[PDB]
Design a protein around this ligand. Structure first.
Ligand code: GDP
Ligand code: GDP
Ligand code: MG
Ligand code: MG
Lengths: 178, 173
């Protein structure tokens, strides 16, 4: 068993809990930690990955220490809410301040991709933020299950790139391509 | 890129043909809409531009073009035909995906341009052809799926496109 501690942060209402629950619902199977922690094991590039998913950003002990426990952070905004996109920047700064020495894997997540007509953040703008500030970008929908699978496979791959040798990840990339 | 593949699709054609009404269906219902859809089992993020005014730069921005006329208006059919050539001329080093779109197919008693004529001209023009009704939603889904396939044919390896055609043939049959 290899653990991947993944933390959801972002403005209230962007879909963190809905993403978490969709992830938990799709995959079969740390209950003592409480109702905001989800554990599921995935197969990624022919190797098991046990994701511990932490969703306690909203205003008990784990909540006050959210920035310190993760191997990887999902900074979520809603594509329909400019304010949440700005909040994601506040969070990026707060997080890289708390973990100054570490190349912490971050995914910027533009959630609610199904709400096409209410879009306030262009995919180009989300992409540009990720490029300039050095993280990965993906648009998702918990409502429609767009890229939910891809998000969690992606975060595993990103953590593995930081942890493991160029050889190991070389075989895994060759596994993924073929 | 990571979990995202982008397709810039531009709607062009005469005023009143139904460019915006098609864009509205795409949106779910303002210059631009952005939606990810699945085609042949693979997600495709379409950036749909609906800002054509009746120039040269608009001919350069797109990965692909939807040239729309109304089946009730012969003048719009001729302009669409003109735009097709202009676009080919504007992008000389490239084979740009184009669909010629005969919109308003619900208005049977008002039609001026026949289905055969549209098909025939499209063969002559070497482009794809489809008739749509934006009012009643017919072939609109097929239109946006079709433009994605078109871009993939130019962009991706011939093995990848072989897999997609097989996937597609199984779904339809
Ligand atoms: N349309 C749509 N609604 C969503 C999506 N994700 C979450 N929601 C809705 O957004 C609201 C807030 O979601 P929630 O998970 O509680 O947000 P949180 O505060 O970040 O944990 C709820 O009504 C959800 O049903 C999505 O991808 N699309
Ligand atoms: N009957 C019918 N009317 C349509 C169709 N598409 C558009 N229209 C109508 O044609 C008018 C012009 O459409 P619009 O989208 O504004 O054309 P545009 O100038 O090319 O963007 C509107 O009043 C629509 O209701 C269609 O498929 N069938
Ligand atoms: Mg929540
Ligand atoms: Mg219009």
């Amino acid at each position: 068993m290899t653990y991947y501690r993944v933390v959801l942060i972002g403005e209230q209402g962007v879909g963190k809990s809905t993403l978490a629950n969709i992830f938990a619902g799709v995959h079969d199977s740390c209950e003592v930690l409480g109702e905001d922690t989800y554990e599921r094991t995935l197969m990624v590039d022919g190797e098991s990955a046990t994701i511990i998913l932490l969703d306690m950003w909203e205003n008990e002990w784990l909540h006050d220490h959210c920035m310190q426990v993760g191997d990887a952070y999902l900074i979520v905004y809603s594509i329909t809410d400019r304010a949440s996109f700005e909040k994601a920047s506040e969070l990026r700064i707060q997080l890289r301040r708390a973990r100054q020495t570490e190349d912490i894997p971050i995914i910027l997540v533009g959630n609610k991709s199904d709400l096409v007509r209410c879009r306030e953040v262009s995919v180009s703008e989300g992409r540009a933020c990720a490029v300039v500030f050095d993280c990965k970008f993906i648009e998702t929908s918990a409502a429609v299950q767009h890229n939910v699978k891809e998000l969690f496979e992606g975060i595993v791959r990103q953590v593995r790139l930081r942890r493991d040798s160029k050889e190991k990840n070389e075989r895994r990339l060759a596994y993924q391509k073929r």
